[PDB]
Structure formats: structure tokens, C-alpha cells
């Protein structure tokens, strides 16, 4: 639970604050301004039966407020300069005849109270924002390409978008610049990404300890997801994968609804959500518990590939870098392999992308591929999280490979944050030396 | 998983065939006539990230095929009268740069194998029926409103729609009469339905019987989904309520994530997809597995009230009758818990009805709210499959009812099937009764 002081588990008012600040202080780089940031609805599987609900991100970024239908606003005060504002939150009116189907919700006190905004109204006083904001002497920045809400778009801020659109002063977007703050983490925000690595770790571990041959996809997805949840994560952040022998080689396989025989591994991604932070991790392992020799082979490959990857995890290389990198490894590998005949075969990495088509990792976050519009050129700062999740895939049917490599694909997986110097391993307890894995079986 | 002759498990080539020979009996009785069915597409958590298929139900009950971006076209024969007509499959044509992301998809000539439908084409193809489909003597029967795919509609069914529009003959919409037909089940869909309602009711037990208390809603969701998964369930069929305490009172809870104290309640509504159809099930027990005496006055009111509304599904009541029924017991048991003090009370159901403010079921089938469309005015029939639910909620806040039952909330679900005489209780393996509940926990 909460902490004195505390929005969200380890975020603190001032926390969230001071994102607002930093927010407004890049607003002001860029008379009037106003930010609107739109929460999620509740969606609905059927007319009569929501899912459970999930914040928009960059909303639960900047206010740490957990309830639908809500809309935050960043206003400019009047004779001073940015990044000086003030922080509104409207809500929804309390309405029992709802409250009796979907629970208590907040009063505007109540948000005022958890969150530590400056005001809040309930949605209806939001229209008395509008004329203002209507001015051609006042800034909007708000995301009408793709709402995060259809409806608050459609009644509170459409006509408005709509209006500013024929002026000399359009509404601008905004989520590009909340990316910017969410690309780099505070310690309170690595510590939430360390709990969600340590517990989808013991997740991973107790898979593997239970692993048997043969055994279910179903049944090991049905074990992960037990031990996650049972562990306090929220959700799953992903549908995992869970591919054995030659579907390991299915780069997108979530059906998780076949046999894993004896001699064949699986391949296990899978990770969690747990005070708004995730996890992402990917092990591959024998269900019967022992690597065969081309198992071992492939696997020591991507490993040795994934260690390199993982000490390139310090300030001032790119992801992009890193690519390079796994791709000029696995071109090594695949030649010391047997795989590759000709060293020309990677000549513009052709062999190295048959072989591993997906990239070495991506940012992650509150999100599984976080701040997807942050270049991946980018050089690496402290604080910012990456993945490293080399891969090497060789199907049933690739008569181009040795008969002992067909149908095997190995993927390893974890989760960094990049430091002054070392990086830090979120997923460090996770086993994946080939020792320490058959000792777990 | 499948016998000889099988689509999907239990329902044969011939079952499907059948299916859309009744579909073009009942258009017949509404020059040429076509009907065109969607497949549901991937859907994506995020850009590069998809969701495990689900297919439409739709189109699934008509075909059985269970592929993503597909097209199912029933076609009247030249020169002979309905019901007679010819089944095609449009599907997308094989691509190995895709099939290494999301896996080996059927050709046409596998389309017609695994179905048993006349004739399958590539997607390109679907162009060379329009033609005659937008001839004013074509009549076309398609779902355009809210559509199953909104790409597949974009591209293939819009413009025909759009010009069919601004015609003398417009296109008519076909879902409520795939309703009729779903409406009344099979034998072999009965057994699936079956096979769905043991493997739930077994899931419930095992959650029972490691109940204690304390204990985490978070651990008893975790705990009946891996129980259902476990047992080869493909998915949940809905967000599950397990709801303790006075949060049982919240008609929609689904967040799932308060501790359950010693001495409350947890009220789980969970079901499960087997094999294509659903189930749709509540318990409500203590979670130190002793019913307090106000417990036990309040649940054995409720299953008493569901023993009753259970015995009046037989052909000619519907479930109109039978939530008039249950009002009137509601109120009854009002009375003789001293919750309601005045007959005159449940004047126009009204003390009832803030005691239990939903409906008493719904149709059940591939869908939890199964044919939504179908009235509930409808005399029931054999074949015809529902759920009864009452329940009875007494808010901790509710100074108008004794102390003793403030903050407990009570559901009791059954699924049943109607037949010739007395009902088929799908969930009869579920323990209800209390000594049953206390001796299990
Ligand atoms: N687990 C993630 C996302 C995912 C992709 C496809 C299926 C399931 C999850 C993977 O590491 C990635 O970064 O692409
Ligand atoms: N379990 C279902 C559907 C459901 C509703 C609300 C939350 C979760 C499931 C419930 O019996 C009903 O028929 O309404
Ligand atoms: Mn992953
Ligand atoms: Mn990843
Ligand atoms: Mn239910
Ligand atoms: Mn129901």
C-alpha cells in the first residue's frame, strides 16, 4: 500500500509534481498555456461487462489518478512565465445509482486529497475553461490524433481542436514531450521496475522448478501467471509467449495450446505489471530438464551474444549500437556453428537478420515497448531502461542449416538500467546459466 | 482434439452444413441472395505486440474456421430456389515473410478440408463477386453497422455496402438471424456447454477447498484461473468478480484486489471457453469455510429463492416470468429476515428491486450474454440454454436493514439447459448446499 505522502506504491506527491514541473519547463521551449491530458475510459467486453480498469499511461504519469472519465489540465498563471502553473484535475459527480454498479469513486476533494493537485471540478466546470482556451492568444497542447477517451474527446475537446484548427494558433501535441520525461527514470521509478524484475524472477524460477516432460504450453502459462499474480503483480504486462520446439521459431506465438515433448525446449516470455511498472523477460529451457549437445551449443551462442549486448549498456552507446553489434555476433556464431559456410553470407548482415529478424531491445517502463517514438540513435543515459533480447531461430524446414539445429530457437531476455557506470540488471535473479537452469529442473 | 469428420471438437462437417442451410431457410422466408459473414482480425495490445485470436462467433457457429482476415460467403444457386445455395471461404493467401511472426495459416485447398465448405479463394478474389452482388436483383445479407473487422470492411464490404445504399435494394442485416438459430442448442453443443460447466464447477472446488482467511482476492482470482487454465479452458469467458465482504455489494466489481477478512464472504462469479462455448457461474461461501448464523440466514434465503426460479425453466415460462417470480420471492424472504418491515413495501417490486437491482439470467451459449437480441419475453423451449442468478445485497451503509446483515452480499449462478421436461442443471457438480460448502472448505 501507501507511504504517507505517497499517489501511487513509491511516488510520492511531490514526485509526481515535479513531472509536471519538468513537463511545463519543456512546454516552455517550445502568452497562455494550456496542457489537457485525457484519461482512459472503461472499456467493455460485452454491452454489460467491463474489463477491469487501466489508466492511460501518460496521464497516471503525470497525477498518479486511477479512475476513469477524468481529465487533467496544466494551465499557465497570469503574469508569470513557465514553467509556474497550476495543476486541475475533473472528475466525475459521485452518482450512487453508478456507485452501486462500479464502486465508490472520488469525490473532487477526495482527488485533491490523494493526488495533491492544486483544484479540482467535476467534469460539467470543464466548460468554463473553453472560452480561453478558445483564444487565438492561448496555446493548447493536447493529443486529438488518436484520444486516448472517445468520448471526453468528442464532447469536451473536439469543437475545440476543431475551432483552433482554422486560427493561427492549431492545437499541438504533447505525448512526444511526456515521452521524454518518461525516457529517463527516477530512483523511486527503478526501484518499482527492481520489485516487478525480482517477483516475475520467482515467477520464472517456480515455471521451471515445476517444468516436466512432456508438458502443456497451457499448463506452463497457467503456472507463470499463477505465480505472478500470487506474488502481488496487478496483471500480466504482455500476453506471454510460451512456444516449445519448433514453435519457438514463431517469433509472435501466443496461443500457448500445444505439447511440449520430451527432448524439445521452451521458450518462455513472459512478465508483469506491478505498481505500474513491467517487466519483460524472455528464458529458454529443456522441459525434461537437460540441454542436448545442439541444444547446449545454440544456447551457450546466444548467451555469449546476450553477456556482449548487456556490457554495451553504458552511457553514450545507442540501441542502435547495440543492434550492430548482436547482428555482427551472431554472424561469428553462426559461422562457428556450422550454420553460415561462407563468410560472405553476412554481408549486409543478411545471414545474421535471416537468422534473428526482430531488434536487440527497446525501452521499457510503464510500458512494455515504452516511449515508442524516442529514437532508438539515441545515446544511452543513465536512467534510461532497456531490453536485451538476442535471439537466434533456425526452422524445421531450413535445409540451409545442420540437421541437428532445425526446429531449435533460443531467445534470452533482461531487463538494464543504464548508470554512471555498470549496468543494473533488474532481472538479475532470473536464472540463465545452463548450470544453474538444470539445477532448478 | 479432434474425431474424424470434426471441425471443432464435438461438431462435425455435417453439424456446420447444416447450420447454414437452416440460416438460408430462415432467409428464404424474409432474383439472387448472398450472405456475407466477417472474421474477427488480430487485435494488438500495442503496435507490435497482438492479442491470442478469438474468432467471431458468427462467423465460427457457421464455419468453424478458426483464422484471422477471413471472409465466409453464402451463395443462392442459379435456377434453384433456397435453401439450396453453395458455402465459400475467402482467406488470405499464404506469406512466408509473415507466417515466421504469426505462423503457419491454411491454404484454400486446407480451408476446404478442415471445413467441409464447396469452394475457398484467395482474399483477391473476393473483388469478382461484387459485381453481381451490387445488381439491384442481388439481395445481400451482411452486418455493416458495428463491423466484426473494420479493415476487411474497409476494403471489401463498404463500397458494396455504400452503393447497395443508394439503391432500391439496401443491404439487410443477418445477426438476429444467426441469433434464432443459436438460440437453440444441439445435442452436441449441450455436450460441449456440458464439458465447459464440469470443468468450471471443478475449478470452484479446488478454490474452495484451499480457502482461508484471510486471504487476497487477488489469490482466489489467481488461484480459479490457474485451475481453469490447468484443465485445458482456452480462456476465461469473462473478467471474474471475486468479491469480499462488503465488496461483494458492488455489482461490478472486477478489480480484485482488497484483502477478504476473517469472517466475510467472497462472492465469485467466474466461467470459462471450452472448446468454443462458455459458462457462467457465482458461488458465495466464507472464506473460513463456517457460515456465521447471519450468513447462514441470508444464503440459505437466496439459494432457496435459485432453488424455486431453477424449477420453473421448462418449456412455456420465460425468463420474464421467471424474474417476476424471483421479485416476489425477493420480497418474501425480505419479510422473513425482518429486512423489510411493511408488506405494502414491495408495491411495484420496489423493495425488491433495491435488493437485487439485476436480472435473474440471460441466454448463455459461444457468448456469456448469449443472443442479446432474443427477448426474454420469449417461452422457453427445448434446447434453449440460461442462467439463474438472484442475488441479495445489504450495503454495510444500509441503516434500513438489521445490523446483522449489513456488509453481506449473496449470488447463487446456475447454468440450465430446458428440455422436454425438467431442466439440465450444467453446473450440478458445484456445490451450493452449505453443509456441502463447509465440508469442502
Ligand atoms: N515480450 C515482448 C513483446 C511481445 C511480442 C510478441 C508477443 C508477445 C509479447 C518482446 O520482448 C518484444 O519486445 O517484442
Ligand atoms: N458473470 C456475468 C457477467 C459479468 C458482469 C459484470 C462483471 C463481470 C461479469 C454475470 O452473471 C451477468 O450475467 O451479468
Ligand atoms: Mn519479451
Ligand atoms: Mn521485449
Ligand atoms: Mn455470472
Ligand atoms: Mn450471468
Redesign the interface.
Known amino acids: 500500500l501507501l507511504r504517507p505522502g505517497e499517489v501511487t506504491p513509491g511516488l510520492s506527491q511531490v514526485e509526481y509534481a515535479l513531472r509536471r514541473h519538468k513537463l511545463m519547463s519543456l512546454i516552455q521551449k517550445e502568452t497562455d498555456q494550456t496542457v489537457v491530458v485525457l484519461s482512459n475510459p472503461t472499456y467493455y467486453?460485452?454491452?454489460?461487462?467491463?474489463?477491469?480498469?487501466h489508466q492511460d499511461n501518460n496521464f497516471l504519469y503525470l497525477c498518479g489518478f486511477q479512475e476513469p472519465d477524468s481529465i487533467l489540465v496544466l494551465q499557465s498563471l497570469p503574469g508569470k512565465q513557465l514553467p509556474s502553473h497550476k495543476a486541475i484535475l475533473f472528475v466525475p459527480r459521485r452518482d450512487p445509482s453508478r456507485?452501486?454498479?462500479?464502486?465508490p469513486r472520488s469525490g473532487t476533494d477526495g482527488a485533491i486529497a490523494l493526488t495533491g493537485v492544486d483544484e479540482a471540478y467535476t467534469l460539467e466546470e470543464f466548460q468554463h475553461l473553453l472560452p480561453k482556451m478558445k483564444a487565438e492568444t492561448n496555446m493548447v497542447w493536447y493529443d486529438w490524433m488518436r484520444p486516448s477517451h472517445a468520448q471526453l474527446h468528442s464532447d469536451y475537446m473536439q469543437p475545440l481542436t476543431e475551432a483552433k484548427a482554422k486560427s493561427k494558433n492549431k492545437v499541438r501535441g504533447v505525448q512526444q514531450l511526456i515521452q521524454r520525461l518518461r525516457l529517463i527514470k527516477s530512483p523511486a521509478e527503478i526501484e518499482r521496475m527492481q520489485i516487478a524484475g525480482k517477483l516475475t524472477s520467482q515467477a520464472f524460477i517456480e515455471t521451471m522448478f515445476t517444468s516436466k516432460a512432456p508438458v502443456e504450453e497451457?499448463?506452463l502459462?497457467?503456472?507463470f501467471?499463477?505465480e505472478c499474480?500470487?506474488r502481488?503483480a496487478?496483471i500480466l504486462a504482455?500476453?506471454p509467449v510460451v512456444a516449445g520446439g519448433n514453435?519457438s521459431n514463431?517469433?509472435?506465438?501466443?496461443?500457448?495450446?500445444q505439447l511440449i515433448k520430451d527432448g524439445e525446449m521452451v521458450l518462455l516470455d513472459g512478465g508483469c505489471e506491478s505498481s505500474c511498472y513491467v517487466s519483460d523477460i524472455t528464458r529458454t529451457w529443456p522441459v525434461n530438464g537437460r540441454f542436448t549437445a545442439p541444444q547446449a551449443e545454440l544456447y551457450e551462442a546466444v548467451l555469449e551474444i546476450q553477456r556482449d549486448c548487456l556490457a554495451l549498456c553504458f552511457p553514450g552507446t545507442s540501441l542502435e549500437n547495440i543492434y550492430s553489434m548482436m547482428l555482427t555476433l551472431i554472424g561469428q556464431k553462426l559461422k562457428d556453428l556450422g550454420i553460415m559456410k561462407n563468410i560472405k553470407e553476412n554481408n549486409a548482415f543478411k545471414a545474421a537478420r535471416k537468422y534473428c529478424?526482430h531488434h536487440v531491445g527497446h525501452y521499457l517502463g510503464m510500458?512494455?515497448?515504452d516511449t515508442?517514438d524516442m529514437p532508438r540513435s539515441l545515446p544511452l543515459q543513465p536512467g534510461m531502461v532497456i531490453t536485451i533480447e538476442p535471439g537466434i531461430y533456425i526452422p524445421e524446414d531450413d535445409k540451409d542449416a545442420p540437421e541437428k539445429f532445425r526446429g531449435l530457437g533460443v531467445r534470452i531476455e533482461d531487463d538494464v538500467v543504464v548508470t554512471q557506470d555498470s549496468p543494473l540488471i533488474l532481472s538479475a535473479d532470473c536464472p540463465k546459466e545452463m548450470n544453474d537452469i538444470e539445477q532448478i529442473c
Chains 1, 2 share one sequence.
Do not use: C, Q
Not at 467486453?45 to 480498469?53: E, L
Open positions: 467486453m460485452s454491452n454489460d461487462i467491463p474489463y477491469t480498469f456507485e452501486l454498479w462500479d464502486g497451457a499448463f502459462y497457467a503456472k501467471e499463477f499474480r500470487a502481488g496487478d504482455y500476453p514453435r514463431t517469433l509472435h506465438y501466443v496461443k500457448n495450446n529478424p510500458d512494455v515497448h515508442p
